[PDB]
UniProtKB/Swiss-Prot annotation, chain A:
Protein name per Swiss-Prot or TrEMBL: Photosystem I reaction center subunit III
Complex and partners: The cyanobacterial PSI reaction center is composed of one copy each of PsaA,B,C,D,E,F,I,J,K,L,M and X, and forms dimeric and tetrameric complexes.
Family: Belongs to the PsaF family.
SUPFAM superfamilies for this protein: Subunit III of photosystem I reaction centre, PsaF (SSF81536)
Gene Ontology CC, one term: photosystem I reaction center
Record membrane topology: Multi-pass membrane protein
Localisation: Cellular thylakoid membrane
From Swiss-Prot, chain E:
Record's protein name: Photosystem I reaction center subunit IX
Native source organism of the sequence: Nostoc sp. (strain PCC 7120 / SAG 25.82 / UTEX 2576)
Primary localization: membrane
Record keyword Thylakoid present: yes
Oligomer and partners: The cyanobacterial PSI reaction center is composed of one copy each of PsaA,B,C,D,E,F,I,J,K,L,M and X, and forms dimeric and tetrameric complexes.
Family that this chain belongs to: Belongs to the PsaJ family.
GO cellular component: photosystem I; plasma membrane-derived thylakoid membrane
Thylakoid found in the keyword field: yes
GO biological process assignments: photosynthesis
From Swiss-Prot, chain H:
Functional summary from the UniProt entry: PsaA and PsaB bind P700, the primary electron donor of photosystem I (PSI), as well as the electron acceptors A0, A1 and FX. PSI is a plastocyanin/cytochrome c6-ferredoxin oxidoreductase, converting photonic excitation into a charge separation, which transfers an electron from the donor P700 chlorophyll pair to the spectroscopically characterized acceptors A0, A1, FX, FA and FB in turn. Oxidized P700 is reduced on the lumenal side of the thylakoid membrane by plastocyanin or cytochrome c6.
Highest taxon of the lineage: Bacteria
Residue numbers of the full-length protein present here: 76 to 149 of 741
Family: Belongs to the PsaA/PsaB family.
Compartments, record wording: Cellular thylakoid membrane
Subunit: The PsaA/B heterodimer binds the P700 chlorophyll special pair and subsequent electron acceptors. PSI consists of a core antenna complex that captures photons, and an electron transfer chain that converts photonic excitation into a charge separation. The cyanobacterial PSI reaction center is composed of one copy each of PsaA,B,C,D,E,F,I,J,K,L,M and X, and forms trimeric complexes.
Organism expressing this protein natively: Nostoc sp. (strain PCC 7120 / SAG 25.82 / UTEX 2576)
Name of the protein in its database record: Photosystem I P700 chlorophyll a apoprotein A2 1
Transmembrane segments: 60-74
UniProtKB/Swiss-Prot annotation, chain I:
Name the record gives this protein: Photosystem I iron-sulfur center
Bilayer topology annotation: Peripheral membrane protein
Gene name in the database record: psaC
Organism: Nostoc sp. (strain PCC 7120 / SAG 25.82 / UTEX 2576)
NCBIfam families (UniProt xref): PS_I_psaC
EC number per UniProt: 1.97.1.12
Highest rank taxon of the organism: Bacteria
Top-level taxonomy: Bacteria, Bacillati, Cyanobacteriota, Cyanophyceae, Nostocales
GO MF annotations, alphabetized: 4 iron, 4 sulfur cluster binding; electron transfer activity; metal ion binding; oxidoreductase activity
Compartments, as annotated in UniProt: Cellular thylakoid membrane
Catalytic activity: reduced [plastocyanin] + hnu + oxidized [2Fe-2S]-[ferredoxin] = oxidized [plastocyanin] + reduced [2Fe-2S]-[ferredoxin]
């Protein structure tokens, strides 16, 4: 797109960097397979692949696929932590259960965390996702 | 004015400076059942006398720290004086004759507000008036 | 040919104004009249 | 306001303003802040009790 | 074994569960980057 | 090259006027 | 009384119950968390055994067991370093060519491109070049192959497990009484004799039988495969007599005091071995023998169960004079009833000793091929300087903790401690004066020099070509040491170190050690050192002497060792505690030692280290620029910090790239410290209030209430990141620069 | 002098009169074609005064005296 | 001097009088609490402003408050 972006296959600087390619892992062809993967990206004038994050599906693997994958994993984590905190408030020793986890409570919660978007929609539509503003504390104005 | 024996210590440089002769000076008196070692508020060890003791000090807080220490020696008859350069000796602690932790009759409420603190007015309501928000 | 004014004004700004100013301000902040 | 009844604080200066507390005891001496209320949360001083008036409380049931 | 219950309550404490869980997570990431290195983007068909 | 001696002397004499007015204003602001 | 073994049987049961109870040891922590303050208090109170129990016997038992656990930690570390030298190093390739192979352990696994760090160190090996000098230590031990390193590592692991079992044993099974610990005379006798004199005598035995023969064969040019095993010098006597002919006479010249036949292997040469640049192994063995005899005799001083000897208490009772009142009367009871007074003395004098070790091990290089390994020399000097500075600060901390907790006015009455309290205004105001004086006449001369050089006035500076300040007393002491092998040490051949004088010793075409000439810049920097040391002393001594009281706050001992303030009144009383004085003294220790190690680095690179030609002239690393550049702050900034940090910034894409990364990340941590040091916790608690609101809205709120750090924890975190970042920057800078140019 | 070559002539802020300067410093700041030691101006006041029509030193002088009387007015 | 004022939410537990290092505070008779006592500050000229009384107070936000004001030799805590 912008500021002299060519495909990596057409760029002489990318093919100049591809010859002297350090091996990332123990196999000798990591440096060659790295540039063979990165050849389909767009390329700056110095030879480096520039990602395009505007949202088109030609470049969806640059940012859109990591976005959906991250949001799924982070929603899993935050949802499971929320559900565990709400699970242990009914037990009357809640502070002890935060420094010492109950595995018998936590492990079904981390197992059931694959359906966090469905559960989050079902809790948003039910109104149990949030508390009322008059029921939580605030400071003097 | 004040009768008492100076406690036994060889002197410190932490004692009382020119403010004593020019501005104000404090004294603490107490009686002891026996001669024993206490710590000065100025730093160092000193032996109190069996009988009446007198120890001139620079600040009142020195006397109340020492009187808090003398309670560990089961001594509760200590008195703190304020001495001016004119020689004017006034009796300040305990002023009433009873320690301030105990209620005594004849004491009046000083600087009592008959409201909770969240009921103080705003600063802009009291602006240019010469009063504070917490007054009265 | 007024370049000689610097050898007057720079010593005045650097010595005479600080001495007179700090002397006034010192005797003013130590004064008990006003 | 009864002993053992869940109440909510209406004192704005309090640590537990708009937060649920539990009544411990109520004094009948005609004093201004008779109701002793206990909390699960402690304040910044580490204390979880305070005296309140009847006007500073609403019952939570 | 009553001491085994004590060991399970020890493993369930916050720093020990943290070091076990983050060791497992870091090990998964390290092993994935051993076998499949250099994934700047997801490659497309 | 530059301006003359007469112009520097005249500018100093003119600068005595905001000096005197600044003295009066600073004393008035204190008063 | 008498010194006997007395031991309780099974005091504490061995059970995992209290591992499930975090904070079981304090009565306040054992209730459980209500805020996040509890979690940090579980760590700040974890080793403060006085808050655990009040009785001194249980505290002493906990200390003795924790010492065994700590020795087990150090032994695991030591045997792990020896195991990396065994399995993952080029040690055997380094023995064959010490001048051209760089020492390296720690091969790095290839995962994310970090096998760039496995650089070509030589000997057919790729790995991280090490700077701790384990290789020189092992060559001085006489170790010639990897299997001896494996046996040493396995022995270290067995010794570590034995220490760990000993700690378990003396806490749970057989715990000593309090009167066992208070036999300080018996402890001093056994330490000075067995731990030091018998240890130095056994090490003299090793140096005579194993180290000096093997190192003499290595220096003669024999290959390390042709050098016989060290037990074959004991079996076959003719090899020793072929190396050292004094072994032909046997043990009979020892007992008949005919010690002159042993002069083959017990020398007094001085100087350095011209092949290795290290000390002579015969001198080192003779040293350990003489030291062994002195410590064995010294450990017979104190009285035990047989009448003869000394009471340390009686020695202390006698030493009173006219100025000092009752003398050292109560000081025995302070050191026998308080572990903090002992930790103050042992930590301050062991930190001073560690600094002394740094100076001695640069100037008289003990190990073979240590002097021409410039990287190891710089790193072990600067390492031991930092360790010594930290331990001195810890000694001052525990002096303040003694004054707050364990000090007794009844015991310490009219003695030296009671009297130094009673004129602390005199001491502290005079130390205040010495610090202001030295700050002017050390740093203000640099400011004068910067201004004079900036104004185009080099003749008005303090330099060698202008107003001269010659360090004339240190020049005098150097001349007296150069002339000592003639008359004031007739049986020495060469001076104690070449740093005082006596010509240039070159090993491998590089300067091992040469005379360190002292001019105006050395005068200026020694007074910078005197100034920064004195300010550090001012802070730490003012913390200890005012730990209990001051004019400002008379009951400071009631508030404790570690408290933030006594509130905003009486002017403002932030940072009056003993902890806070340790806190500020940490910064000044950092400042001082940073200037110490910068002085070492630039002085040794500019005036000592470098190459020697066949003509004999020495070309140094930075070219002698210390004399004219180090007298200005601009010269330091330019020719030391800008010029020598070219190697750590130009190091991406090389094997030294981790040091560039650590250089930047240490700058990050040092800058991150200033968030904690400059701010305060009322802001942060009010910010946590809005974050806790946003959690209470979404019903994700912990029962453990989020709190900001305490005031003291804000200070501790800030100074910890300040020290971590500032020292790791100097670490990465020293490493990348000296691994390039050394 | 800056009028006839704004690209190659350094503007002058003011003169230096400093008795602390040694002779190499006095030589080092005798720059931009000046008779003595001077400071170079970096505030762009030459470009601004040249753009808005000023051409001589007398015009700058009358500007400064006008601002002296204008400050007297305030 | 500083200004120390006592609000009506006092419970009379006398902890501010005990915490005070300079004897500012005393307990007086009262009838608005169960302990029948408030704290009172007659000697605010001895007040250094260290706020140990506010540290010692158990009520939810402070039956007693210190308002820092003009500085004297006593309020600054100078022995000279
Ligand atoms: C249960 C876990 C959890 C969840 C769901 C949230 C949720 C939230 N936090 Mg968060 N927080 C947490 C833990 C959590 N927090 C912890 C432990 C800390 C202390 C480090 C913080 C510190 C924190 C700050 C400082 C801020 C938030 C903010 C927020 C909000 C915006 C999202 C965000 O910034 O996330 C990002 C949160 C972080 C990067 C903090 C670390 C998160 C950790 C790594 C996850 C905890 C994992 C948990 C312990 C696992 C439990 C599993 C269980 C089965 C045992 C959102 C309401 C922001 C806000 O108020 O926005 C309106 C904000 O400013 N939080
Ligand atoms: C901004 C105004 C200013 C001015 C105009 C001067 C002017 C001078 N300074 Mg000074 N100085 C100043 C600020 C200033 N200073 C400040 C703020 C500092 C602190 C950083 C210094 C620190 C400083 C030092 C340390 C020295 C000077 C010296 C000098 C002299 C120049 C060197 C020389 O060859 O003369 C030589 C001329 C003489 C020796 C004749 C002295 C002039 C007579 C005594 C004037 C009488 C005035 C008296 C108060 C009445 C000159 C008189 C040097 C000097 O020689 O001064 C003694 C010198 O040693 N200055
Ligand atoms: C927040 C900033 C940030 C971001 C966005 C990234 C992003 C990335 N880093 Mg990076 N990195 C960061 C901080 C960050 N890093 C920091 C702070 C450092 C220094 C310690 C590094 C050091 C670093 C190195 C040294 C390397 C990366 C690599 C990568 C790439 C990930 C390859 C991978 O494993 O994906 C694939 C991951 C998954 C498929 C996740 C699977 C998780 C589970 C199993 C899935 C479960 C399914 C439901 C990606 C572009 C690597 C790379 O490929 O280079 C481009 C690489 O070699 N980074
Ligand atoms: C733009 C700058 C500026 C202006 C217009 C003012 C204006 C004022 N200041 Mg002020 N002030 C300033 C900067 C300024 N200040 C700064 C930077 C400081 C910090 C040091 C102060 C510190 C300060 C103090 C401490 C006091 C004032 C006072 C005053 C008032 C009277 C001034 C006076 O006594 O003149 C006296 C000055 C002169 C006569 C000098 C004039 C000589 C020239 C050559 C003519 C006036 C409202 C005073 C006030 O309000 O008291 C009622 C007062 O006590 N100011
Ligand atoms: C104490 C000093 C010390 C240090 C700093 C190291 C450091 C290292 N060793 Mg090492 N080692 C040591 C002692 C030491 N060792 C000793 C004493 C031995 C003899 C037993 C060895 C034997 C050894 C071998 C045989 C190897 C290493 C290797 C390594 C490297 C990688 C280790 C790694 O990734 O672990 C991975 C770490 C973990 C998986 C941590 C698990 C964390 C758990 C969950 C914590 C449990 C807490 C709680 C109780 C539950 C690393 C440089 C390897 C290497 O390649 O070196 C070049 C290698 O092959 N070491
Ligand atoms: C703890 C130290 C230590 C130990 C274990 C030994 C052990 C030994 N030495 Mg010895 N030695 C030592 C220190 C030590 N030495 C010191 C410090 C010196 C110098 C004074 C000597 C000087 C010495 C000589 C001169 C000889 C021995 C010999 C011996 C061996 C036989 C001793 C004997 O006959 O009875 C034995 C291996 C003899 C031997 O067999 O040589 C191998 C022998 O001739 N030693
Ligand atoms: C032989 C050495 C020695 C010993 C036994 C002690 C022992 C003690 N000290 Mg002490 N101290 C020492 C050296 C020593 N210190 C030194 C060298 C200093 C100066 C730096 C101090 C300064 C000092 C102060 C100022 C205080 C103590 C206190 C204490 C007591 C409680 C310690 C505790 O609970 O641990 C708690 C330990 C921790 C919570 C660990 C802290 C982690 C550190 C700060 C970070 C380390 C970073 C690491 C080196 C590198 C980064 C790694 C990272 C990435 C993981 C205990 C009696 C305290 C006390 O109450 O005394 C009675 C106290 O207030 N000491
Ligand atoms: C570069 C920064 C810097 C500087 C200059 C200082 C300066 C000083 N600190 Mg320090 N300090 C610093 C950073 C610094 N600190 C930091 C970061 C901390 C935080 C931990 C501290 C914490 C700290 C403590 C805790 C202590 C000090 C102390 C001191 C004093 C040392 C003794 C003395 O008088 O020195 C001599 C003075 C100097 C070297 C300053 C420069 C003097 C110049 C060169 C000469 C004057 C120039 C000129 C004549 C003036 C011209 C004026 C012009 C307007 C006319 C001094 C005032 C100690 C102290 O007060 O003990 C007496 C002390 O106890 N400091
Ligand atoms: C240069 C600053 C010199 C100030 C001292 C003035 C000497 C006047 C001497 C003189 O004119 O005295 C006359 C003038 C009027 O006061 P009197 O002397 O009448 O004093 C009696 C009064 O107490 C009125 O009752 O005194 C003051 O202005 C003194 C107060 C100055 C207070 C300082 C305020 C100015 C500070 C702000 C300027 C500094 C910041 C710089 C801004 C760029
Ligand atoms: C702590 C570090 C020392 C810094 C202090 C230096 C400046 C301070 C001046 C001292 C003021 C008063 C001192 C106490 C006043 C005092 O008590 O005087 C009296 C004291 C002797 O007191 P007594 O006669 O009562 O002896 C009784 C003793 O048993 C103690 O009770 O004399 C000295 O200690 C003078 C020593 C001066 C200290 C300087 C010597 C330092 C040793 C240097 C050796 C290092 C190796 C050098 C190798 C070349
Ligand atoms: S709250 Fe903080 S700033 Fe204030 S006096 Fe205490 S320690 Fe100092
Ligand atoms: S601020 Fe200090 S002196 Fe004043 S009332 Fe409180 S505790 Fe007493």
């Amino acid at each position: 797109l912008g500021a002299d972006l060519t495909p990596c296959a057409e760029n002489p600087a990318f093919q100049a960097l591809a010859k002297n390619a350090r091996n990332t892992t123990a196999d000798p062809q990591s440096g060659q397979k790295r540039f063979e993967r990165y050849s389909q990206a767009l390329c700056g004038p110095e030879g480096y692949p520039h990602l395009i994050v505007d949202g088109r599906l030609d470049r969806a693997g640059d940012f859109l696929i990591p976005s959906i994958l991250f949001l799924y994993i982070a929603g899993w984590i935050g949802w499971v932590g929320r559900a565990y905190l709400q699970a242990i408030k009914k037990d009357s020793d809640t502070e002890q259960k935060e420094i010492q986890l109950d595995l018998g409570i936590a492990l079904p919660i981390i197992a059931t965390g694959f359906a966090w978007p469905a559960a989050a929609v079902k809790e948003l539509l039910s109104g149990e996702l949030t508390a009322k503003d008059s029921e939580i504390t605030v400071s003097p104005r | 004015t004040l009768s008492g024996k100076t406690p036994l210590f060889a002197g410190s440089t932490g004692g009382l400076l020119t403010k004593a002769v020019e501005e104000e000076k404090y004294a603490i008196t107490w009686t002891s059942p026996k001669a024993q070692v206490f710590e000065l508020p100025t730093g160092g060890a000193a032996t109190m006398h069996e009988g009446e003791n007198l120890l001139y000090i620079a600040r009142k807080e020195y006397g109340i720290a020492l009187g808090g220490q003398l309670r560990k020696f089961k001594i509760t008859n200590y008195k703190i004086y304020r001495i001016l350069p004119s020689g004017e000796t006034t009796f300040i602690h305990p002023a009433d004759g009873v320690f301030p932790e105990k209620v005594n009759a004849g004491r009046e409420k000083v600087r009592f507000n008959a409201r909770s603190i969240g009921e103080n007015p705003n600063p802009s309501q009291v602006k240019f008036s010469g009063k504070a928000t917490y007054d009265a | 040919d007024a370049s000689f004014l610097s050898s007057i004004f720079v010593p005045v700004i650097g010595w005479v104004v600080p001495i007179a100013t700090f002397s006034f301000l010192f005797l003013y902040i130590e004064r008990e009249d006003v | 306001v009864q002993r053992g009844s869940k109440v909510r604080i209406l004192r704005p200066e309090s640590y537990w303003f708009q937060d649920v507390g539990t009544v411990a005891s109520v004094d009948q001496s005609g004093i201004k802040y008779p109701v002793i209320v206990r909390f699960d949360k402690v304040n910044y001083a580490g204390i979880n009790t305070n005296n309140f008036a009847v006007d500073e409380l609403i019952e939570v049931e | 074994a009553d001491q085994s219950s004590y060991l399970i309550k020890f493993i369930s404490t916050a720093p020990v569960a943290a070091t076990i869980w983050l060791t497992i997570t870091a090990g998964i990431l390290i092993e994935f980057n051993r076998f499949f290195p250099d994934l700047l983007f997801h490659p497309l068909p | 090259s530059s301006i003359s001696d007469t112009q520097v002397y005249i500018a100093l004499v003119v600068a005595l006027i905001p000096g005197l007015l600044a003295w009066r204003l600073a004393t008035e602001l204190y008063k | 009384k008498k010194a006997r073994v007395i031991v309780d049987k099974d005091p504490v049961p061995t059970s995992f119950e209290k591992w499930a109870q975090p904070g079981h040891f304090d009565r306040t922590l054992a209730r459980g968390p209500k805020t996040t303050t509890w979690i940090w208090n579980l760590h700040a109170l974890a080793h403060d055994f006085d808050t655990h129990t009040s009785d001194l016997e249980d505290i002493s038992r906990k200390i003795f067991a924790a010492h065994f656990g700590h020795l087990a930690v150090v032994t695991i570390w030591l045997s792990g370093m020896i195991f990396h030298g065994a399995k993952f190093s080029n040690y055997e390739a380094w023995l064959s060519d010490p001048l051209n192979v760089r020492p390296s352990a720690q091969v790095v696994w290839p995962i994310v491109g970090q096998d760039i760090l496995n650089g070509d160190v030589g000997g057919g090996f790729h790995g991280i070049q090490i700077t701790s000098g384990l290789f020189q230590v092992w060559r001085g031990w006489g170790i010639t192959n990897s299997f001896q390193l494996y046996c040493t590592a396995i022995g270290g692991l067995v010794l570590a497990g034995l220490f760990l079992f000993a700690g378990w044993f003396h806490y749970h099974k057989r715990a000593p009484k309090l009167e066992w610990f208070q036999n300080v005379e018996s402890m001093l006798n056994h330490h000075l004799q067995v731990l030091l004199g018998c240890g130095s005598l056994g090490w003299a035995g090793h140096l005579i039988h194993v180290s000096a023969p093997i190192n003499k064969l290595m220096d003669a040019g024999v290959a390390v495969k042709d050098i016989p095993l060290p037990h074959e010098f004991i079996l076959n006597k003719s090899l020793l007599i072929d190396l050292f002919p004094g072994f032909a006479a046997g043990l009979t010249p020892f007992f008949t005091l005919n010690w002159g036949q042993y002069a083959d292997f017990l020398t007094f040469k001085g100087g350095l071995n011209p092949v290795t640049g290290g000390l002579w192994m015969t001198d080192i063995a003779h040293h350990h023998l003489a030291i062994a005899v002195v410590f064995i005799i010294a450990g017979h001083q104190y009285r035990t169960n047989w009448g003869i000897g000394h009471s340390i208490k009686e020695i202390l009772e006698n030493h009173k004079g006219p100025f000092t009142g009752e003398g050292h009367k109560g000081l025995y009871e302070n050191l026998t009833t308080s572990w903090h007074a002992q930790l103050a003395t042992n930590l301050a004098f062991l930190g001073s000793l560690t600094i002394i070790i740094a100076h001695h091990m640069y100037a008289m290089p003990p190990y073979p091929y240590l002097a021409t390994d410039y990287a190891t020399q710089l790193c072990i000097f600067t390492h031991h300087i930092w360790i010594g500075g930290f331990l001195i600060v810890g000694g001052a901390a525990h002096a303040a903790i003694f004054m707050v907790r364990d000090y007794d006015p009844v015991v310490n009455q009219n003695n030296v401690l009671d009297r130094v309290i009673r004129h602390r205004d005199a001491i502290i105001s005079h130390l205040n004066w010495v610090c202001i004086f030295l700050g002017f006449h050390s740093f203000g001369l640099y400011i004068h020099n910067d201004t004079m050089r900036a104004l185009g006035r080099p003749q008005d500076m303090f330099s060698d070509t202008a107003i001269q300040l010659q360090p004339v007393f240190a020049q005098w002491v150097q001349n007296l040491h150069t002339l000592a092998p003639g008359g004031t040490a007739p049986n020495a051949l060469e001076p104690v170190s070449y740093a005082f004088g006596g010509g240039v010793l070159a090993v491998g075409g590089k300067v091992a050690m040469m005379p360190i000439a002292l001019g105006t810049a050395d005068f200026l920097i020694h007074h910078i050192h005197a100034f920064t040391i004195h300010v550090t002393v001012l802070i730490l001594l003012k913390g200890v002497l005012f730990a209990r009281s001051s004019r400002l706050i008379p009951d400071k001992a009631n508030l404790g060792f570690r408290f933030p303030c006594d509130g905003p009144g009486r002017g403002g009383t932030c940072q009056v505690s003993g902890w806070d004085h340790v806190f500020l003294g940490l910064f000044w220790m950092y400042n001082s030692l940073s200037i110490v190690i910068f002085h070492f680095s630039w002085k040794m690179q500019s005036d000592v280290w470098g190459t020697v030609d066949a003509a004999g002239n020495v070309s140094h690393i930075t070219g002698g620029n210390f004399a004219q550049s180090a007298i200005t702050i601009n010269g330091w900034l330019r020719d030391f910090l800008w010029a020598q940090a070219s190697q750590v910034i130009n190091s991406y894409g090389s094997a030294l790239s981790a040091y560039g990364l650590m250089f930047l990340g240490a700058h990050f941590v040092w800058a991150f410290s200033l968030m904690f040091l400059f701010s305060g916790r009322g802001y942060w608690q009010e910010l946590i209030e809005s974050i806790v609101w946003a959690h209470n809205k979404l019903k994700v709120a912990p029962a453990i209430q989020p709190r900001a750090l305490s005031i003291t924890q804000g200070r501790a975190v800030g100074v910890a990141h300040y020290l971590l970042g500032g020292i790791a920057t100097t670490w990465a800078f020293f490493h990348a620069h000296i691994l390039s140019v050394g | 002098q800056w009028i006839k070559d704004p690209l190659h002539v350094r503007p002058i802020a003011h003169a230096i009169w400093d008795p602390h300067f040694g002779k190499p410093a006095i030589e080092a700041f005798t720059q931009a074609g000046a008779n003595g030691p001077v400071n170079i101006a970096y505030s762009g006041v030459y470009h601004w005064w040249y753009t808005i029509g000023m051409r001589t030193n007398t015009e700058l002088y009358t500007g400064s005296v006008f601002l002296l009387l204008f400050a007297s007015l305030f | 001097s500083h200004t120390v004022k006592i609000y009506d939410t006092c419970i009379g537990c006398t902890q501010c009088v005990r915490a005070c290092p300079t004897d500012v505070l005393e307990m007086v008779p009262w009838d608005g609490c169960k302990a029948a006592q408030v704290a009172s500050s007659p000697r605010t000229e001895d007040c250094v402003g260290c706020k140990r009384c506010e540290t010692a107070c158990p009520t939810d936000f402070l039956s007693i408050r210190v308002y820092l004001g003009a500085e004297t030799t006593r309020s600054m805590g100078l022995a000279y």
